[PDB]
Ligand binder design. Structure first.
Ligand code: FES
Ligand SMILES: [Mg+2]
Length: 559
């Protein structure tokens, strides 16, 4: 039995335990502390005050900001107990201790002690021990940093570059220490994700660092934000929400981040190349960068993305190291006849459920020749159910020939798994009032494909059709006529916002049920919006847009 202090602190409370990872953004409501992931075993449970046992986290990089907000409002669990490596929630609690004078203890157990303690009714944590129903286990103190540092690293840490840079380096070194890294690594560019207005604390952190003098040292793009930056006032977004959401975006721009406002930064001209070491947040962008581009970045939590951008340095750990990019589990995926575009997000979603805490190699799919957009949708869905920052697809992705670990296990995704996942993501009626496309932000080709399915037909008056995309794609779609073709059918194309960040009234208030082709939004949509969510192919979406009805049925390749 082994217990390891990750972040110090004292806590006591009832045990809240699960064997399935949870994403605090999208899966936990900062207003209540309740689990809102409708597909998680803990759905509906309030986490406030509990000692939360889960193997690790999954999903969104924004969990750090949601946990920070919960800590600040007193709605957070009293402690976190994992049994695997974890970064997102650990970083949120680390920022709480470093910058907000609040300690949330985080402990990692061995898997067997984890399972035993998860049966307990009550757990007490202090600096030296964890006790489950009185049964006490000694807790090893936080790991001591054994990092190789450059002279400029030490200069930043000593404060010779100011207090903001020192604070960033302090956080980077503490994260490297808990990961057991022995060095840092240069990054050529950053991508900031905490600009989504997921909680008041997201704004508080950004303005705190900006007022501290923080500024990025490497070129750094920005993920989606929670306002249509140029239009939210005219759209009728309430001032109480739009003003802090806009100020959150403004704070990162003031700190030198480029206002790309997109969750598909790999589509920008600034996209990194194969082998390039970058420092990115946003789970789908991280996974796409490693998986499809062959670039290298850990799945950095929100807030850590800014520290890495401020210093140009990240912990040399995880998939920055070649050994850690080798496939850790093999997945044979059934390839039925007659697949369409919906196959790829479904497979990514199921691949994450099958392999939630290590890097999988997906076999059996190379002959199907997935598009860049197919890989994009797959990676985004994989992020929702997994913690890993990358995956491999035999015959499709550039590093898929890396030798798997000699002890890799092999699992399957069967047709039966696919039918079950399809029905899980389709718990809603047939009548829909909204079609939601573009999580992550739509490519230009995805917009062209959508116009091709529409074939000049016009949406039903009672069905809104909304595509979220980055500004540069919308500009390009305006040039080549795709934007007008979509407008001709009644489709709205929105910049900056994504389905992760959209809000009423831009999200139409009349909506009761929506259909999406995003595996990611199919998962998060129910809890985020309170609406019933349907999941289908691009053409399933267009058919619903023209008729107002999404037929409830398994796809052709599953019947
Ligand atoms: S911001 Fe979440 S995928 Fe777009
Ligand atoms: Mg996710």
């Amino acid at each position: 039995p082994e217990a390891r202090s990750i972040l110090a602190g004292a806590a006591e409370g009832k045990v809240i335990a699960t064997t399935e990872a949870l994403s605090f953004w999208g899966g936990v409501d900062p207003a209540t502390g309740k689990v809102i992931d409708v597909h998680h075993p803990l759905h509906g449970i309030c986490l406030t005050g509990g000692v939360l046992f889960m193997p690790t986290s999954r999903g969104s990089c924004t969990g750090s900001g949601v946990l920070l907000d919960l800590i600040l409002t007193g709605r957070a669990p009293s402690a976190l107990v994992f049994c695997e490596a974890e970064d997102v929630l650990t970083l949120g609690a680390l920022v709480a201790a470093e910058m907000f004078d609040k300690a949330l203890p985080v402990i990692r157990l061995d898997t067997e002690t984890f399972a035993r303690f998860s049966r307990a009714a009550h757990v007490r944590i202090d600096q030296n021990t964890i006790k489950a129903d009185g049964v006490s286990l000694a807790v090893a103190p936080p790991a001591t940093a054994h990092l190789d540092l450059t002279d400029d690293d030490r200069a930043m840490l000593e404060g010779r570059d100011g207090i903001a840079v020192r604070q960033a380096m302090r956080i980077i070194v503490a994260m490297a220490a808990q990961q057991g890294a022995s060095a840092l690594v240069d990054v050529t560019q950053g991508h900031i994700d905490g600009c989504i207005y997921a909680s008041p604390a997201n704004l508080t952190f950004a303005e705190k660092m900006a007022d501290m003098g923080g500024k990025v040292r490497v070129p750094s793009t920005m993920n989606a934000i929670s306002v249509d930056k140029a239009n939210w006032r005219a759209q009728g977004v309430p001032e109480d929400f739009g003003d802090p959401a806009a100020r959150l975006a403004d704070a990162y721009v003031r700190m030198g981040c480029r206002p790309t406002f997109t969750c598909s930064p790999y589509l920008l001209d600034s996209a990194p190349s194969a082998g390039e070491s970058i420092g990115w947040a946003e789970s789908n962008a991280v996974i796409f960068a490693n998986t499809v581009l062959g670039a290298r970045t850990a799945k950095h939590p929100d807030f850590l993305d800014l520290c890495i951008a401020m210093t140009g340095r990240a912990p040399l750990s995880g998939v920055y190291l070649e050994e850690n990019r080798r496939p850790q589990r093999i997945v044979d995926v059934a390839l039925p006849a007659g697949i369409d575009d919906a196959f790829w997000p479904l497979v990514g979603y199921l691949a994450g459920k099958a392999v939630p805490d290590c890097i999988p190699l997906l076999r059996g799919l190379g002959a199907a020749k997935p598009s860049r957009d197919d890989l994009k949708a797959l990676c985004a869905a994989f992020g929702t159910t997994s913690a890993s920052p990358m995956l491999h697809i035999e015959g499709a992705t550039p590093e898929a020939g890396l030798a798997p670990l000699e002890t890799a296990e092999t699992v399957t995704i069967s047709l039966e798994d696919m039918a079950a996942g399809w029905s899980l993501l389709n718990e809603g009626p047939e009548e829909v009032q909204l079609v939601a496309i573009g999580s992550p932000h739509a490519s230009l080709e995805e917009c062209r494909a959508l116009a091709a399915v529409f074939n000049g037909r016009k949406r039903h008056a009672d069905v809104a059709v909304i595509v979220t995309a980055g500004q540069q794609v919308i500009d390009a779609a305006g040039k080549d006529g795709t934007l007008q073709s979509l407008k001709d059918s009644g489709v709205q194309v929105l910049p900056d916002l994504c389905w992760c960040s959209i809000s009423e009234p831009v999200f139409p208030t009349k909506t009761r049920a929506l259909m999406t082709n995003s595996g990611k939004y199919a998962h998060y949509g129910p809890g985020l919006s309170g609406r019933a969510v349907r999941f289908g192919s691009l053409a399933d979406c267009v058919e619903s847009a023209l008729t107002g009805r999404a037929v409830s049925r398994l796809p052709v390749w599953l019947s």
